[model samples]
Target: QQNKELNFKLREKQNEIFELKKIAETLRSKLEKYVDITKKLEDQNLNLQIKISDLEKKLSDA
Candidate 1:
């Protein structure tokens, strides 16, 4: 009887862990997408900054 109870608890914990893993996988995918978008934006911002600086230099020279 004691062994059966222990086995039942073990199964329950395993099921909980399985659910948590699925949640974690979903969240991880979302985070990856966010990171990719962030990287692209960062590159775009850097290019814009360079262009702005060149324009400013040109204006100051004139």
Candidate 2:
């Protein structure tokens, strides 16, 4: 009877570990997606600023 109880506890711990790993993976993926989107926006803003500067230079020259 003692052996059976110990086995059950071991199984419960294994199940808990499995669930935690799944949760961690989901969170990591979400974080990666957020970083990618932020980088894309930053690049777009930089491009716009460069264009604006170019246009301003042209106007001053004219």
Candidate 3:
């Protein structure tokens, strides 16, 4: 009887760990995609700033 109870508890703990691992994997994939999008936006913003500066320089000379 004692051995059966112990085995039941062990199985519950194993199942809990399995669920946590699956959730972690999903979060990791989403984080990677978020980082990729952020980098692309940063590059686009930098390019726009450079263009604005060039336009200002031309107007000031005129």
Candidate 4:
């Protein structure tokens, strides 16, 4: 019957939305990890620059 077909279609759509939500969750976790690594690298680079400047100043003074 037409009502049965409509019910089937609704179930299909609901399943599709559930799958999409799972994918979104996976991507969100990956993005958070990537951002964390990027921030750590930025901090390391800043520290290296400071060390290089300190060495240069010592060399000039010597």
| lDDT per residue (tens digit) for residues 9-33 in model 3 | 9999999999999999999999999
* Angstrom error at residue 29, model 2: 0.7
Angstrom error at residue 56, model 2: 5.0
Q: Write the per-residue lDDT of candidate 4 for residues 2-35, one digit (tens) a residue.
A: 9999999999999999999999999999999999
1-62 in candidate 1: lDDT tens per residue?
A: 79999999999999999999999999999999999999999999999999999999999977
Question: What TM-score would each prediction reach against the true structure?
Answer: 0.69, 0.71, 0.79, 0.80
Using TM-score as the measure, the top candidate is 4
lDDT of 2 at 36: 97
Comparing 1 with 2 on lDDT, the higher-scoring candidate is: 1
Preferred candidate (TM-score higher): 1 or 2: 2
Assess the local accuracy of residue 62 in candidate 1 as a C-alpha lDDT between 0 and 100: 75
Relative to the true structure, candidate 3 reaches a TM of 0.79
**lDDT scores of the candidates, listed in order:** 0.98, 0.98, 0.97, 0.98
- Native RMSD of candidate 3 (Å): 1.5
For all candidates, what are the clash counts?
0, 0, 0, 0
User: Against the correct fold, how does model 1 do in TM-score?
Assistant: 0.69
lDDT of 4 at 60: 98
